[PDB]
Write a protein that binds this ligand. Structure first.
Ligand SMILES: CNC(=O)[C@@H](c1ccc(Cl)cc1)N1CCC[C@H]1C(=O)O
Ligand SMILES: CNC(=O)[C@@H](c1ccc(Cl)cc1)N1CCC[C@H]1C(=O)O
Length: 339
């Protein structure tokens, strides 16, 4: 519909203006109080912080420049920040400030206190199909938006989907997102969610996101991912076979959608055909979905996370609390000039 085409054209105009002229250096570390570590990774951490003047809470991603360099994530970290400062969509966590210092890169994101979908899914076991569908619809729209901007997300998994105060998803972690007009080649993503063409070291495209949506929908509705095995090599063999077994409790419509998203041949995969995202949005499994009402956040969510306020960390887990040290000398200044 022309209304959708015009919405996406405007979205792309607005993205490109920020993409071409990225914001930089919009806060500094001593404007915030450190509260709690919300998560950790190979080269950084996410910390709940409070802005000392406004009292607002944020999730501050802190990346150690020297570890970014050593783990070959320079371009990925520059992609992440340049993309996040340029996008704007209801189901993406917003980047509020970014800056760097002698030791670290900082991305100060809105704080979503409801926690990761991962925790909620593991606690309940599996989501009903309507509940999985409510979240899936948000991802479909988010990927429609991102792909229209030539962006591939490349890290869809339940840990990266935060549940907000209204029960809606906010996607976090753009560490593997990239602007790609054709193909790209980097091996990245978590094993259970990788498309076959990534495992096989091919040049791949936005169809890997639609594969990962199939994995996410399966895992939401089953409670476990479709290619589960004990070690990555075994997961990869299952993925490239694409042999999927569906629980008998799945509806026929869900199984049909998943066979088309978990299509090993990327040239036959839903989301990657002539009709693009509309093969997904028009599939029978989504027949009850009001796409506009989802976008406008007018659908009552399947559940509302329990939390006490914008500073509550009870839905995140506990980590050893380590210093945020800032060296007296600048590290890796050249590599991160554009950040
Ligand atoms: C203001 N909203 C729209 O123009 C779109 C929309 C929203 C987001 C995206 Cl990424 C694409 C399209 N509405 C209108 C009709 C279809 C429906 C939809 O959400 O599919
Ligand atoms: C995006 N938010 C997070 O917290 C991320 C994270 C942590 C550190 C960094 Cl540098 C980047 C990303 N992790 C990784 C998977 C689960 C989660 C955690 O540990 O809770």
């Amino acid at each position: 519909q022309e209304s959708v085409k015009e919405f996406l054209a405007k979205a792309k105009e607005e993205f490109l203006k920020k993409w071409e002229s990225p914001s930089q250096n919009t806060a500094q570390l001593d404007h915030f109080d450190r509260i709690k570590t919300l998560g950790t990774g190979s080269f950084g951490r996410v910390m709940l912080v409070k802005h000392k003047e406004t009292g607002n809470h944020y999730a501050m991603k802190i990346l150690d420049k020297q570890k970014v360099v050593k783990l070959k994530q320079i371009e990925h970290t520059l992609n992440e920040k340049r993309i996040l400062q340029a996008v704007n969509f209801p189901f993406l966590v917003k980047l509020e400030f970014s800056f760097k210092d002698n030791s670290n890169l900082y991305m100060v994101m809105e704080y979503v206190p409801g926690g990761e979908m991962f925790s909620h899914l593991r606690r309940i076991g599996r989501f009903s199909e309507p509940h999985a569908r409510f979240y899936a619809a948000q991802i479909v729209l988010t990927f429609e938006y991102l792909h229209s901007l030539d962006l591939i997300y490349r890290d869809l998994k339940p840990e990266n989907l935060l549940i907000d105060q209204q029960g809606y998803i906010q996607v976090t972690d753009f560490g593997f997102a990239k602007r790609v007009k054709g193909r790209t080649w980097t091996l990245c993503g978590t094993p259970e969610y990788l498309a076959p063409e990534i495992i096989l070291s091919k040049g791949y495209n936005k169809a890997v996101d639609w594969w990962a949506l199939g994995v996410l929908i399966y895992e939401m509705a089953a409670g476990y991912p479709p290619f589960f095995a004990d070690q990555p090599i075994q997961i990869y063999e299952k993925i490239v076979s694409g042999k999927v077994r569906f629980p008998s409790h799945f509806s026929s419509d869900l199984k049909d959608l998943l066979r088309n998203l978990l299509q090993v041949d990327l040239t036959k995969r839903f989301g990657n055909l002539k009709n693009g995202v509309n093969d997904i949005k028009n599939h029978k499994w989504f027949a009850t979905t009001d796409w506009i009402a989802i976008y406008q956040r007018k659908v009552e969510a399947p559940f509302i996370p329990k939390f006490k306020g914008p500073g509550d960390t009870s839905n995140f887990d506990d980590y050893e609390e380590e210093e945020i040290r800032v060296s007296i000398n600048e590290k890796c200044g050249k590599e991160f000039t554009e950040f």
